[PDB]
Design a binder for this molecule. Structure first.
Ligand SMILES: [Cl-]
Length: 114
């Protein structure tokens, strides 16, 4: 019975970044979505619970259906030039061990596009 919550991210007028605060428990996950253009550089940084991880998916790609174009490194961050235009998906999740313990995962996701 796993839940996915989708959170559309829209930058304020004239802004190229935002920070979101969220939380999820166990195997629940959050999909943060963001429309961007091919060739722009996206930077993603996750903070808060050490259990928090993310995968970046290009438009149309769903967890389980295609490979992510990126994920958090050991410092909780990722940066890359975007191959495609459209709505990107940042999947925030925790790994099986702590999911299975039912840990709650408060986190902050900072995303910017330039
Ligand atoms: Cl922790």
């Amino acid at each position: 019975a796993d839940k996915i919550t989708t959170v559309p991210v829209q930058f304020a007028k004239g802004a190229h970044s935002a920070q979101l605060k969220g939380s999820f428990t166990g195997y629940d996950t959050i999909h943060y979505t963001l429309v961007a253009k091919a060739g722009q550089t996206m930077t993603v940084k996750i903070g808060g619970s050490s259990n928090a991880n993310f995968n970046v998916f290009a438009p149309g790609a769903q967890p389980g259906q295609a490979e992510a174009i990126g994920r958090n490194d050991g410092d909780g961050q990722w940066q890359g030039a975007l191959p495609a235009s459209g709505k990107y998906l940042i999947q925030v999740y925790q790994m099986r061990a702590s999911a299975r313990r039912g840990e709650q995962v408060p986190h902050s996701l900072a995303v910017s596009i330039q």
